[PDB]
Every structure is written in C-alpha cells, then in structure tokens.
Design an enzyme around this catalytic site. Structure first.
Site, PDB file in Angstrom:
ATOM      1  N   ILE A  19       0.852  -1.197   0.000  1.00 52.08           N
ATOM      2  CA  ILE A  19       0.000   0.000   0.000  1.00 52.08           C
ATOM      3  C   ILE A  19       0.896   1.258   0.000  1.00 52.08           C
ATOM      4  CG2 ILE A  19      -1.600   1.456   1.425  1.00 52.08           C
ATOM      5  CD1 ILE A  19      -3.327  -1.092   1.916  1.00 52.08           C
ATOM      6  N   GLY A  20       1.804   1.342   0.957  1.00 57.13           N
ATOM      7  CA  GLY A  20       2.723   2.469   1.086  1.00 57.13           C
ATOM      8  C   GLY A  20       3.683   2.271   2.238  1.00 57.13           C
ATOM      9  N   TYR A  24       9.253   4.689   9.616  1.00 52.79           N
ATOM     10  CA  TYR A  24       9.551   3.486  10.394  1.00 52.79           C
ATOM     11  C   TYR A  24       8.510   2.378  10.212  1.00 52.79           C
ATOM     12  CZ  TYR A  24       6.229   5.708  13.645  1.00 52.79           C
ATOM     13  OH  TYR A  24       5.108   6.305  14.163  1.00 52.79           O
ATOM     14  N   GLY A  25       7.773   2.417   9.108  1.00 60.50           N
ATOM     15  CA  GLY A  25       6.733   1.430   8.843  1.00 60.50           C
ATOM     16  C   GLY A  25       6.339   1.233   7.394  1.00 60.50           C
ATOM     17  N   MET A  26       5.666   0.099   7.111  1.00 60.43           N
ATOM     18  CA  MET A  26       5.161  -0.257   5.786  1.00 60.43           C
ATOM     19  C   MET A  26       3.763  -0.846   5.934  1.00 60.43           C
ATOM     20  SD  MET A  26       6.685  -2.963   2.973  1.00 60.43           S
ATOM     21  CE  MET A  26       7.909  -1.809   2.343  1.00 60.43           C
ATOM     22  N   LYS A  42      -0.019  -3.110   9.083  1.00 60.59           N
ATOM     23  CA  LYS A  42       1.063  -2.156   9.181  1.00 60.59           C
ATOM     24  C   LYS A  42       2.239  -2.775   9.947  1.00 60.59           C
ATOM     25  CE  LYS A  42       0.061   1.572  11.654  1.00 60.59           C
ATOM     26  NZ  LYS A  42      -0.541   2.891  11.958  1.00 60.59           N
ATOM     27  N   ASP A 137      -3.052  15.746  14.840  1.00 55.13           N
ATOM     28  CA  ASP A 137      -2.516  15.651  13.478  1.00 55.13           C
ATOM     29  C   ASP A 137      -3.603  15.346  12.453  1.00 55.13           C
ATOM     30  OD1 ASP A 137      -0.412  15.811  11.547  1.00 55.13           O
ATOM     31  OD2 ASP A 137      -0.043  13.645  11.689  1.00 55.13           O
TER      32      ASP A 137
HETATM   33  O1  LIG Z   1      -2.335   3.912  10.034  1.00 52.61           O
HETATM   34  C1  LIG Z   1      -2.511   3.970   8.814  1.00 52.61           C
HETATM   35  N1  LIG Z   1      -1.941   4.949   8.074  1.00 52.61           N
HETATM   36  C2  LIG Z   1      -1.014   5.962   8.584  1.00 52.61           C
HETATM   37  C3  LIG Z   1      -1.322   7.272   7.855  1.00 52.61           C
HETATM   38  O2  LIG Z   1      -0.438   8.279   8.335  1.00 52.61           O
HETATM   39  C4  LIG Z   1       0.357   5.393   8.291  1.00 52.61           C
HETATM   40  C5  LIG Z   1       1.229   5.106   9.335  1.00 52.61           C
HETATM   41  C6  LIG Z   1       2.462   4.513   9.068  1.00 52.61           C
HETATM   42  C7  LIG Z   1       2.802   4.150   7.763  1.00 52.61           C
HETATM   43  F1  LIG Z   1       3.997   3.568   7.504  1.00 52.61           F
HETATM   44  C8  LIG Z   1       1.921   4.421   6.718  1.00 52.61           C
HETATM   45 CL1  LIG Z   1       2.317   4.012   5.071  1.00 52.61          CL
HETATM   46  C9  LIG Z   1       0.695   5.006   6.992  1.00 52.61           C
HETATM   47  N2  LIG Z   1      -3.305   3.075   8.164  1.00 52.61           N
HETATM   48  C10 LIG Z   1      -3.884   1.930   8.905  1.00 52.61           C
HETATM   49  C11 LIG Z   1      -5.318   1.582   8.526  1.00 52.61           C
HETATM   50  C12 LIG Z   1      -5.492   1.639   7.034  1.00 52.61           C
HETATM   51  C13 LIG Z   1      -6.592   0.975   6.491  1.00 52.61           C
HETATM   52  N3  LIG Z   1      -6.806   1.032   5.184  1.00 52.61           N
HETATM   53  C14 LIG Z   1      -5.995   1.748   4.406  1.00 52.61           C
HETATM   54  N4  LIG Z   1      -6.251   1.749   3.055  1.00 52.61           N
HETATM   55  C15 LIG Z   1      -5.534   2.595   2.098  1.00 52.61           C
HETATM   56  C16 LIG Z   1      -5.900   2.074   0.688  1.00 52.61           C
HETATM   57  C17 LIG Z   1      -5.260   3.001  -0.355  1.00 52.61           C
HETATM   58  O3  LIG Z   1      -5.717   4.340  -0.107  1.00 52.61           O
HETATM   59  C18 LIG Z   1      -5.347   4.928   1.153  1.00 52.61           C
HETATM   60  C19 LIG Z   1      -5.945   4.074   2.286  1.00 52.61           C
HETATM   61  N5  LIG Z   1      -4.939   2.395   4.890  1.00 52.61           N
HETATM   62  C20 LIG Z   1      -4.670   2.371   6.196  1.00 52.61           C
HETATM   63  C21 LIG Z   1      -3.462   3.135   6.682  1.00 52.61           C
END
Ligand SMILES: O=C(N[C@H](CO)c1ccc(F)c(Cl)c1)N1CCc2cnc(NC3CCOCC3)nc2C1
EC number: 2.7.11.24
Length: 328
Positions: A19-20, A24-26, A42, A137
């Site tokens: 996803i991204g 300090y995380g993926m 995560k 934030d």
């Molecule tokens: O905690 C996060 N994200 C925070 C944002 O700052 C975060 C923290 C550390 C990181 F290392 C990254 Cl990378 C991102 N989450 C968990 C729950 C969840 C659930 N679903 C989707 N789906 C995606 C589908 C594609 O579009 C965006 C949402 N994403 C997420 C991200």
C-alpha cells in the site's frame, strides 16, 4: 516477502499487496483467512528511536481502548514471543478503500458528501475529545474512506491527553504564537475549506509563511485577539506585520453553502477561546440532516509520563500492551 522486506504475518494472513510506507513502517493489504475479508497490516519498526516508540505505544494504547464507528480500530497485533526477538510489530486493522487526500485530488465532492464527511469527522472527534484526548494531526490523509462513504479517523501517533512532520498546513495559529481541544477544531476547519474548493486553504511554504497565509485570509487580529497573545516577542511580531483585511468567505468560496461558510468561520476563529467546540459544531444548522445526539457516543472512561521515558522502557511497555494477542 514484500519489496525486499520480511512480512511474517501468516498463516492466517495471506495474499499481501503493498500500500505504502513511512519513516519506520510499511502498510500492506492482506487476506484474513479467518474473517474472509481483506485487512490492512502495518509493519512498524520503531525500537531504535525514542519518538517512534512513543508514537507506537500511543497509537496501540489509544486505539485498543477506543471503540467508535468513525475511528479505525486494532483487530490483531503480531510480534515475536520474546522481547529480544521483537524487532517489528504488525498492526492489523480494517482495510479502507481510500483516504480524503486521494479523494480531493481526483473528485468534485457534492454538498451532501462534504456535509456527511464533516459530520463523521466531528462525530469521531466528539468521542476522542470526550476521552480527554487530542489527535493533534488531523489532515485529509488521516481520514480513511470506504466504498459506502463511511469515514474513519486514523494515525494516533501524535495523540496526547488534553492538558489545559510532513505538513503544517493544518496547524492552529496559537501553536506558533505560544494547547487545547481547539487545535483539533482548527485542523477540521482547514479540512472543510479543502473539501469546498479541492485545495489547501493555508499552504505555507516555510514556518513564518504559514501564519502569513492565515492572516492573509482572516485579516489582522483584533485588539482582543492580540491581548490574548501573552508572549512578548510573538505579540511584537504580530503587531509588526502589514495590515490585512479579512477576505469574505463567499469571495473565496462563491459556490459553497452559506451554512457551511458560517460553520467554517466559527472553526477557523483566530482566538482558540472563541473557537467552536465539537458538540456546538455538531448542532450547527449546516449539519442538521445528520445531527443525532442520541447516536453520537462518548468514551466510557477518560484516557490516562511518556515524553521522558527512554526507548528501552517504551519497548517493554509495547511488549506488555501486545501480550494479550499472543498464542497460549
Ligand atoms: O495507520 C494507517 N496509516 C497511517 C497514515 O499516516 C500510516 C502510518 C504509518 C505508515 F507507515 C503508513 Cl504508510 C501510513 N493506516 C492503517 C489503517 C489503514 C486501512 N486502510 C488503508 N487503506 C488505504 C488504501 C489506499 O488508499 C489509502 C488508504 N490504509 C490504512 C493506513
């Protein structure tokens, strides 16, 4: 394996897709073979830095205690059986389709969708603030959305108990000039303004530029606004700046609902003591089609030292907090 990194989550969680990533995380999506749905996982590796350990412990402790439809929860936590072997922690959460940042880069939001997203942000914020917690934030990328327009607030890494960085475009003016729940209401105001025109309202290029963008729209502060700036040098700085007249909201947003602009005005009040509170914002006429206080729950218990603990003690606290998810 995911892009050269080990993601040891199985056998329950399979079919991983990137996803991204962060400092300090993926994040990956994966298929939960027990619940029969794709989930978000995560992988966080924070144990070499004090700040990352604080962010990790805060997110875990807060999200495990919170239970609300408009706040992301934690479904499962995977880590090694011993502290010495624990290098990473995997946080399993509900998979969301997109976030408000992505949505605003691609779509024109109808007045009904803007109204409904603002309602859900405030509904979740009511719960957070009733737990005596500040998110600190709030921004479009921290607002997750699913296919049915359901919204969930995520990333409680910077959250703190109320005691009264990639972007500063959502930070309240008092953060620079001097904090209360009023700092989250400011960030919500910035998000509403962004939903109205698909652009950040105060896109500051540098530290002092952020305040100039704020004053360039709000106009120079009144004498009462200035009197509330206790810091000598910050008051002298505000007095030294060129005079600015308030830009009327309908000039900036000629197509917006006048009730949304009235609420926007109250959320983006320079003086935090005069800024609208979450329960007052929910009861505002702009949100009348969704406002339902019998369906806007509060935390069962207010939430309750970390900023001074070393990273090695914070790792022990993370290990203790995640223990109930381990096998027998
Ligand atoms: O905690 C996060 N994200 C925070 C944002 O700052 C975060 C923290 C550390 C990181 F290392 C990254 Cl990378 C991102 N989450 C968990 C729950 C969840 C659930 N679903 C989707 N789906 C995606 C589908 C594609 O579009 C965006 C949402 N994403 C997420 C991200």
């Amino acid at each position: 394996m995911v892009r050269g990194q080990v993601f040891d989550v199985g056998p329950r969680y399979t079919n991983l897709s990137y996803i991204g990533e962060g400092a300090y995380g993926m994040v990956c999506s994966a298929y939960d073979n027990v619940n029969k749905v794709r989930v978000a996982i995560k992988k966080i590796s924070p144990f070499e830095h004090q700040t990352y350990c604080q962010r990790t412990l805060r997110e875990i402790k807060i999200l495990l205690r919170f239970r609300h439809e408009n706040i992301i929860g934690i479904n499962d936590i995977i880590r090694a059986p011993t502290i010495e072997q624990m290098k990473d922690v995997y946080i399993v959460q509900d998979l969301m389709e997109t976030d408000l940042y992505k949505l605003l880069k691609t779509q024109h939001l109808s007045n009904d969708h803007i109204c409904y997203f603002l309602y859900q942000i405030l509904r979740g914020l009511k719960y957070i603030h009733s737990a005596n917690v500040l998110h600190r934030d709030l921004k479009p990328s921290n607002l997750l959305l699913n296919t049915t327009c359901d919204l969930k607030i995520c990333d409680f890494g910077l959250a703190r108990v109320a005691d009264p960085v990639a972007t500063r475009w959502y930070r309240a003016p008092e953060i620079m000039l001097n904090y209360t729940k009023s700092i989250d209401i400011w960030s919500v105001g910035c998000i509403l303004a962004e939903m109205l025109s698909n652009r950040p309202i105060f896109p500051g290029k540098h530290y002092l530029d952020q305040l100039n963008h704020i004053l360039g729209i709000l106009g120079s502060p009144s004498q009462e606004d200035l009197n509330c700036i206790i810091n000598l040098k910050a008051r002298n700085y505000l007095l030294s700046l060129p005079h600015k007249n308030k830009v009327p909201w309908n000039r900036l947003f000629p197509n917006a609902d006048s009730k949304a602009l009235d609420l926007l005005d109250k959320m983006l009040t320079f003086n935090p003591h005069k800024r609208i509170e979450v329960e007052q914002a929910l009861a505002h006429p702009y949100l009348e089609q969704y406002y339902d206080p019998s369906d806007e729950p509060i935390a069962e218990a207010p939430f309750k030292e970390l900023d001074d603990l070393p990273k090695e003690k914070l790792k022990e606290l993370i290990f203790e907090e995640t223990a109930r998810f381990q096998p027998g």
